[PDB]
């Protein structure tokens with residue numbers, strides 16, 4: 063009954079993640095002034111360049127140069143020696159208003175509760191009782207390894223670290239009637255951008271002793287665990303200089319690390335009317351409510367929409383065999399307890415609040431008691 | 443035991459899909475001259491602009507202006523009245539060489555069979571016996587609806603059609619010991635860009651009579667099927683003018699429509715050393731070989747890699763309860779029959795051949811007998 067499963071995560075300076083954080087810094091800057099801003103901000107990053115492309119209709123006055131540069135500064139790209147510098151990079155803006163054809167079909171002259179979905183699409187939510195935060199251990203550990211790298215970079219413990227990093231964790235699990243039980247960590251990968259002076263052996267030793275051992279419980283590590291630390295051998299060129307980044311290219315890192323399911327939509331740079339984000343947050347809220355409510359040990363929820371239509375077109379449940387109730391009975395409980403119209407989700411999850419940049423690294427789920435992480439008490 | 447499931451697809455002129463097709467036109471242009479080109483081409487599309495950003499190291503001499511414009515011409519954006527014109531749009535190029543740090547860690551001075559993975563990551567393959575092509579009916583139908591729109595646009599049957607489209611299909615299924623059996627189509631969405639002259643009722647009638655009825659078998663449609671045809675009411679502004687597009691933003695449309703699983707990596711614009719593409723193709727080949735070989739009715743395969751390491755770090759199997767063999771026995775059969783090193787996948791699947799633009803619309807799987815769609819005969 064044992065099996066392996068692998069998930070990855072990336073750091074704040076991974077170029078795709080830089081784009082997600084900038085897109086959400088732009089969204090938050092608009093929402094601080096106009097809670098009803100319509101935002102669809104894509105970011106592209108390559109050597110020396112941040113380009114903003116997309117559609118924004120808002121009453122806010124946003125200084126894009128300042129917002130972008132402050133986000134890059136926070137990430138830590140502040141000198142040409144690191145491959146990217148917020149002070150001197152090019153910031154290009156190609157932002158237009160939201161299409162009036164979309165606006166008239168989605169929200170113009172509509173009661174807020176009855177606003178249409180901002181697009182068609184499908185979205186999923188997942189929760190698992192294997193961790194207290196109801197997330198897969200593989201992705202939790204992968205995120206925490208990147209967070210540890212950023213912490214040691216920022217506190218000057220490992221001054222050779224740079225912001226761009228990737229991690230990957232393979233866990234060996236057992237299964238019990240559809241629920242999963244972590245046994246041990248089988249393999250860990252860490253790749254992190256570094257300065258020209260540090261030796262490979264010094265980095266590998268520090269990654270094992272100061273990063274992995276500070277994150278992963280010793281009970282999961284043994285003489286057979288496989289470590290791939292700086293496996294490329296050299297990672298001096300990094301950030302956008304090493305690899306072009308785009309918003310919405312880390313959608314599996316943002317969610318469940320390959321567990322559960324994904325409908326394809328990106329989260330960052332989008333206001334609540336874009337159901338790719340709001341309905342995925344609501345589906346996570348449903349799934350976590352079912353698991354914390356004791357109905358399931360793990361569960362997957364699908365929802366779907368049509369542009370301009372408020373009610374979901376479909377809702378579906380997969381309980382992995384971890385409920386005494388059938389999937390039909392769980393679906394009836396979901397329909398009795400949740401209203402997944404976007405104009406109701408916005409109110410339940412407070413989605414006009416400018417907290418989005420906080421979601422744009424280390425996963426959107428299983429952290430910080432955001433509204434979609436506070437279970438709803440179910441009536442049935 | 444009945445349940446709903448929804449998948450979507452998009453047309454050739456959807457702005458994200460335009461980017462995937464351009465990225466793969468660039469990859470094919472390089473491979474036509476240099477089978478060993480290292481390509482990581484991202485495309486961004488917005489009003490009047492195609493930007494290429496990424497990393498290419500190749501001996502080819504490629505005219506990017508010509509390759510991009512020819513791809514846009516093929517899609518059908520050939521006049522400012524349609525919102526985008528290959529003849530007059532801006533083509534911007536921000537392409538640099540592949541990082542020498544990546545090159546030395548992945549492929550320099552390595553025997554081809556022993557080349558390292560081009561990145562870390564996780565990838566999945568899926569197959570289901572519900573259709574002869576071993577794909578979910580939801581996504582097959584969604585793709586065929588977009589293909590039908592493009593066919594009627596190109597043959598002049600519906601001259602008001604423009605290239606940008608989206609479709610979505612919800613199927614009601616029954617289940618039989620983990621396998622799925624389609625019963626009926628519950629809901630269909632179609633949104634397609636159109637000219638200024640055609641009436642909404644004329645479009646809705648044509649979409650039902652000439653598109654849906656020409657694609658979906660009548661046995662799946664009944665008086666209760668729900669149709670959302672042009673649900674926004676107006677879609678004149680479209681293509682990149684209506685919504686910025688990026689490469690690798692339709693990864694679920696490219697794969698299984700939400701069924702199976704996804705590791706997050708995009709396919710388009712990448713050569714075989716980028717395991718996000720090559721190992722996902724190989725995992726599809728494994729899954730389809732298990733189902734066509736009669737071992738499973740449906741199956742999911744995960745594989746994962748570390749940058750610079752040739753052998754996968756992990757391989758895992760989920761058979762949904764549709765095999766008499768355990769997942770451990772199926773995994774042993776996979777390990778005995780397949781070698782998922784990227785330097786072996788390239789040979790088995792002929793991945794230096796310039797056929798990639800053909801994959802970049804209507805899904806990478808279940809079509810055209812590409813090498814990953816030809817099952818391997820298994821020995822056990």
Ligand SMILES: C[S@@+](CC[C@H](N)C(=O)[O-])C[C@H]1O[C@@H](n2cnc3c(N)ncnc32)[C@H](O)[C@@H]1O
Nearest residue numbers: 076253294296297304305482497540543544561
């Ligand atoms: C390996 S690059 C992707 C392939 C790349 N576009 C190419 O031209 O081959 C993807 C990510 O890996 C990381 N990376 C970049 N350079 C690296 C190196 N030398 N060693 C390890 N990882 C690296 C960065 O996080 C980067 O965003």
Ligand SMILES: C[S@@+](CC[C@H](N)C(=O)[O-])C[C@H]1O[C@@H](n2cnc3c(N)ncnc32)[C@H](O)[C@@H]1O
Nearest residue numbers: 102117160163164181456633674676677684685
């Ligand atoms: C609805 S747009 C996404 C949201 C958009 N970025 C915004 O500013 O609100 C996503 C896709 O839907 C399609 N689309 C664009 N305009 C549309 C319209 N008026 N009606 C229906 N679908 C439309 C196009 O395929 C487009 O790429």
Ligand SMILES: Cc1cccc(-n2c(=O)nc(N(C)C)c3ccc(Cl)cc32)c1
Nearest residue numbers: 320321322702703742743744758759760
């Ligand atoms: C459909 C789907 C999607 C995503 C993940 C899984 N999935 C999972 O939830 N449970 C696993 N167990 C308990 C054996 C499992 C093992 C291997 C693989 Cl490849 C996937 C697995 C399933």
Ligand SMILES: Cc1cccc(-n2c(=O)nc(N(C)C)c3ccc(Cl)cc32)c1
Nearest residue numbers: 322323362363364378379380700701702
């Ligand atoms: C883990 C995972 C990922 C993706 C899809 C599914 N999955 C599926 O394979 N089979 C379904 N059956 C048979 C009931 C199903 C029904 C509802 C939902 Cl939300 C998902 C379903 C499962």
